[PDB]
TrEMBL record:
Residues 34-300 form the Tryptophan synthase beta chain-like PALP domain. It comes from the Bacteria. The gene is cmnB. Keywords: Pyridoxal phosphate. This is CmnB. SUPFAM superfamilies: Tryptophan synthase beta subunit-like PLP-dependent enzymes. The keyword ATP-binding does not apply.
Length: 342
């Protein structure tokens, strides 16, 4: 171990011992005449305000031994959340960090990345092309060549991503509500979270249904990429970590139901979840309607609504999509679903 590498490892292990337990909010909603409990795993209640704080620590740990000195620049592609966490860890460690982003990124998340002193490399792909991710990966490789010291953790293929969720995220959930949860709903982009959770649950709770939630136009599990307004959830490439056989079901959600879920849940309970979380809640509403015997499920909520305050919760961003922020109208997009505290 070099000097820089020993320290990084130690910082990462301190962050992990000091990482809080992520809470669960218990919510009830009647679906097709049958009451259901949603266990919302609120991963935005966390130091870097998303689940990707765990991902980021997993990844930094894996790239530490590659660090000779403090010359190293950390480069990574992100839709947002991983940026914030890697950005913060690198600020805390004194290591420079370049975040490769595109124009679709949530402004709130982009601002939290800049505030951590990262360098933003914006990619100029026009919003409503389908090559954003490939263009980001493209630009990352240009930067790894053009910058000495440069180190790419590769969230997309680095097994540390799935591994952290298998060994940390999934046991915590299991320990909290494993005896109760008949299903777990998980949004996909890289697929590392679900691949990790699935690896844990298929061993420890085989009877628990694992359900991927994705959005229209995402090709995590195959298909033809299409344009999307939501971020975090969805990718224009197949997952390295996960195939369709590794989970029990897969539901795609229209983005307007995801948006509707965000607003209605907030109105009904005061829990404001992030965009992918709304898609997960919408997806669980659909899935439970088709499964009368499923009455308790975890929704893994990747982040919270404060990250989307100038998109998903902004009346002006919604107007070009023909949507209000009126909970009553948006409830019609969820078949009248009503949430309450359990
Ligand atoms: C993670 N997405 C990112 C690509 C990132 O750069 O942070 C993500 C996900 C999907 O999680 P995976 O483990 O499948 O990548 C879902 N929801 C949000 C908000 C998010 O940041």
């Amino acid at each position: 171990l070099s000097t820089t590498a020993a320290e990084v490892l130690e910082h990462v292990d301190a962050a992990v011992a000091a990482y809080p337990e992520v809470p669960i909010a218990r919510v009830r909603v009647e679906v097709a005449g049958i009451p259901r409990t949603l266990l919302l795993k609120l991963e935005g209640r966390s130091p870097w305000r998303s689940i990707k704080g765990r991902t980021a620590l997993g990844l930094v740990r894996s790239i530490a031994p590659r660090m000779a000195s403090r010359d190293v620049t950390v480069v990574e592609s992100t839709s947002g959340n991983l940026g914030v966490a890697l950005s913060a860890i690198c600020r805390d460690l004194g290591l420079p960090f370049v975040a490769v982003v595109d124009l679709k990124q949530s402004p709130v998340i982009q601002a939290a990345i800049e505030a951590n002193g990262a360098r933003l490399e914006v990619v100029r792909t026009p919003a409503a092309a389908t090559t954003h991710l490939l263009d980001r990966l493209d630009r990352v490789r240009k930067l790894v060549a053009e910058i000495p010291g440069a180190v790419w953790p590769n969230q997309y293929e680095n097994d540390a991503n799935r591994h952290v969720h298998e060994t940390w995220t999934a046991p915590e959930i299991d320990r909290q509500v494993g005896g109760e949860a008949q299903a777990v709903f998980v949004a996909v982009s890289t697929g590392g979270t679900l691949a990790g959770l699935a690896a844990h649950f298929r061993r420890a709770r085989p009877a628990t249904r694992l359900v991927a939630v994705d959005v229209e136009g995402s090709t995590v599990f195959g298909g033809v990429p299409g344009g999307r307004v939501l971020t975090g959830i969805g990718a224009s490439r197949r997952s390295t970590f996960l195939t369709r056989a590794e989970c029990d079901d897969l539901v795609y959600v229209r983005e307007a139901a995801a948006i509707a879920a965000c607003h209605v849940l907030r109105a009904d309970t005061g829990i404001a979840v992030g965009g992918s979380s709304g898609a997960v809640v919408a997806g669980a509403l659909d899935h439970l309607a088709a499964h009368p015997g499923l009455t308790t499920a975890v929704c893994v909520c990747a982040d919270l609504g404060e990250n989307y305050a100038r998109t998903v919760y902004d009346p002006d961003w919604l107007a070009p999509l023909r949507l209000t922020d009126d909970p009553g109208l948006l409830r019609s997009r969820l078949r009248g679903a009503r949430f309450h505290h359990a």
